[PDB]
Design a binder for this molecule. Structure first.
Ligand SMILES: CCn1nc(C)c2ccccc2c1=O
Ligand SMILES: [Mg+2]
Ligand SMILES: [Zn+2]
Length: 324
């Protein structure tokens, strides 16, 4: 159905001014939004205006949208409002460093898709919902949550005074929603592996062409994964703290499986905390390093994301060796 923000919430956002010392900070890939909670809605407005312009969206409509988007996130340990803004910030840094490669419609679509990508998340994986016949898995067979997140995105845009894309042409509005839809779906990690493998082959053979739409869609997809997994690109102390949140949500899912007499995978088992550093080595080796390596090849200015991920891989290797 989607929840609406209050008049007080959106009007408070309209008046927000980002402190000048942070304008330079937000441009960095390693930027951590963590210590500026009150500013997160305002940080998103700032990023939208810098990337798309102050004339791109009607200020009141944009403020209503952000605040209603904020309300439609649940108070789960990881897949919350904080994660939405963190993923949107990383997209802003990628877009800013590759400005002319993407259209005005892609830049507005991607930043919106990133803030909306995990809308109404329940703290449960797709496999869990499918295994326990949850109504969301009956409605959406594959990429269960991701289809629900896009359904929630459309629902918020269809609220009163929330359609931030109304001023686009009928063809452009259709285009923007398709951009948002493919971007949200791409955040399903199960789709990433095949997507990155296709991109690798295209890059190595020299057949990758950003003029080709299917290629573009695949590049956008990898950008989505790269933003979604960005906690691995922060400074070590931030990366550790976000892992705690990721695991707290995983262990609660594992607890639900145990209550139903099902042993969860070690990742979702709170009695298997000792296995985490090896699980992180495996995740960096087969997921994060390949992701950021392919991203840096396609978009060389995204190199600092790979550099930070490689530093965090080094820290996890240091944990294993007994140097933590
Ligand atoms: C703690 C870093 N991390 N670690 C793991 C293991 C993971 C597994 C599936 C989806 C996302 C993640 C992830 O972000
Ligand atoms: Mg998700
Ligand atoms: Zn996410």
């Amino acid at each position: 159905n989607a929840s609406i923000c209050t008049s007080e919430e959106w009007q408070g956002l309209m008046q927000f001014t980002l402190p000048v010392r942070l304008c330079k900070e937000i441009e960095l890939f390693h930027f951590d939004i963590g210590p500026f909670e009150n500013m997160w809605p305002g940080i998103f407005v700032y990023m939208v205006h810098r990337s798309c312009g102050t004339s791109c969206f009607e200020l009141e409509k944009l403020c209503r949208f952000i605040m209603s988007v904020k309300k439609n996130y649940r108070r789960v340990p990881y897949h919350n409002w904080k994660h939405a803004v963190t993923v949107a910030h990383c997209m802003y840094a990628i877009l800013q460093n590759n400005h002319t490669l993407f259209t005005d419609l892609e830049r507005k679509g991607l930043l919106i898709a990133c803030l909306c990508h995990d809308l109404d998340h329940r703290g449960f994986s797709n496999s869990y919902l499918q295994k326990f016949d949850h109504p969301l898995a009956a409605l959406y067979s594959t990429s269960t949550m991701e289809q629900h997140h896009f359904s929630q995105t459309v629902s918020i845009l269809q609220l009163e005074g929330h359609n931030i894309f109304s001023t686009l042409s009928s063809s452009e509005y259709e285009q923007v929603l398709e951009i948002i839809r493919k971007a949200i779906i791409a955040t399903d990690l199960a789709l990433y592996f095949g997507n990155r493998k296709q991109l690798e082959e295209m890059y190595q053979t020299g057949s990758l062409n950003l003029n080709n739409q299917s290629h573009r869609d695949r590049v956008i997809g990898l950008m989505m994964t790269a933003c979604d997994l960005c906690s691995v690109t922060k400074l070590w102390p931030v990366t550790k703290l976000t892992a705690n949140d990721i695991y707290a949500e995983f262990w609660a899912e594992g607890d639900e499986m145990k209550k139903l007499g099902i042993q969860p995978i070690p990742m979702m088992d709170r009695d298997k905390k000792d296995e985490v550093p090896q699980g992180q080595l495996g995740f960096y080796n087969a997921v994060a390093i390949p992701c950021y390596t392919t991203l840096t090849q396609i978009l060389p200015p995204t190199e600092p994301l790979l550099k930070a991920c490689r530093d965090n891989l080094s820290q996890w290797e240091k944990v294993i060796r007994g140097e933590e």
